[PDB]
Amino acid sequence: DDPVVQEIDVYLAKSLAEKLYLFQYPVRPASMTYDDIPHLSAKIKP
Amino acid sequence: MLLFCPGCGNGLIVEEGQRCHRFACNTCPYVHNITRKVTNRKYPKLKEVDDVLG
Amino acid sequence: IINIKKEKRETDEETKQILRMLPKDVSVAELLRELSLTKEEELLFLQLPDTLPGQPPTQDIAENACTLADLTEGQVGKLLIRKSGRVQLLLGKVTLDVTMGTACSFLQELVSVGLGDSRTGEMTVLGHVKHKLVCSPDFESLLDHK
Amino acid sequence: DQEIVQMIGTEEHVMAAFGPSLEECQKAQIFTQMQALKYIGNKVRRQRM
Ligand SMILES: [Zn+2]
User: Fold this and answer.
1) Do A32 and B9 touch (CB under 8 A)?
2) Measured between CA atoms, how close is D28 to chain A, in angstroms?
3) For residue A19, which of A7, C103, C114, D49 is within the disulfide window of CB 3.0 to 4.6 Å?
4) CA distance readout (Å), C4 to B27, C7, C32, D43
C-alpha cells in the first residue's frame, strides 16, 4: 500500500496565533446559523 | 414527540393562541403556530402468541 | 410559516420533522471528494498530539512540549494517502495517522477575535467547522523501529 | 433541557422514558441554576446545628 495519491503539503501560520477562538453552540444544530441574526455587543475578558 | 425551543432549548408545550393551536416555550416569547397535520405514532407491541401448549 | 425557523427534531442529523412535500465516512474518501468531486475550500479542525516530533527552536528550552506555538511558518509536513484508505501525516522522520473525530452535528463557528486596540476589538467570523480530525502517533511503528 | 436530553441519549425510547422527568421539572418553576440551588438548599438538612 504505497501513498498513491494526495501528497498534500501542510503549512503553519502564526498570524492569528493569539486571536483565534473556536465558538461552538451545544444547543444549535449546524443547519441553522446565526448569519442573519443582527448582533448587538460582545463582552469579553482577555 | 419531544420538541425544544430554538431560542433557549427548553421543552415546548402545546397551547392555544387566538387563532390556532401552537407550540410554546414556558420561559421565552417564542411560539410556533401549527400549519398542517403533525403526528407521533408509537406502534406498541401486539400480542402475537396463540398460547397453545401441552 | 417561516421555513428557516421551524421547530427542531431532537436528532440533530434529522431535524426535518416537517417537510414541504448518514453512513460513516472515512478520511481518504473525505479528502478525495473534497478535491476531486469539488474544488471548494473547507475548514477543518484537527487535534494534534500533545508533543510534536521536534524541538523548540531557540525558545530557551529539557525535552519539554513542542507544540505549534513554537514552530515557524512554511511547510512542516506532508499528508500521505495510501492504498486501502490509510491516511498518514509524515511530519518529518516520523509519521502519525489521521482519523475521523466525533461526528459533530451542532454549530461550530471558527471566528477571529482580534483585539487591535486595548479598548476596541474585532470579531471576524472566518467560517464554519464541520468535520474533526484526530492525529495520533503510530505507536506500532515507533516500537518495532527500536 | 435540550442539552440535558442530548446528554442522556438521542435514541427514541430514551426520550420516551425520560420525558416524564422533564414534565415533572417543568411543572415546577425551576429554570435557572439559582432556582435549582435554592430548591436543593431547601431540601438540605443541618448536621446537628
Ligand atoms: Zn424558549
Assistant:
1) no
2) 23
3) C114
4) 22, 9, 32, 43
Enumerate residues 6+ apart whose C-beta is below 8 A from C141: C94, C95
User: Which chain D positions have a beta carbon within 8 Å of C11's beta carbon?
Assistant: 10
The answer, for A25 touching chain B at a CB cutoff of 8 Å, is no
B7 touches chain A (CB under 8 A): no
Cα Rg of chain C (Å, integer): 20
Taking phi first (over 0 means left), then psi (-120 to 50 degrees means alpha), and beta for anything else, what does residue D9 get?
left
Give the resolution value in Å. 3.0
Nearest C-alpha neighbor of C72 from the set C90, C56, C53: C56
Rama region for B9: left / alpha / beta (φ>0; ψ in -120 to 50; rest): left
- Contact at 8 Å (CB) between C30 and C44? no
CB contact under 8 A, D15 and B13: no
Phi-psi region of C32 (alpha: psi -120 to 50; beta: other; left: phi over 0): alpha
**What count of Cα atoms within 13 Å lies in the side-chain half-sphere of residue C56?**
13
Question: CA torsion sign, C51 to C52 to C53 to C56?
Answer: negative
For chain C, first and last CA: distance in Å? 66
The separation between CA C97 and the C-alpha centre of its own chain, rounded to angstroms, equals 13
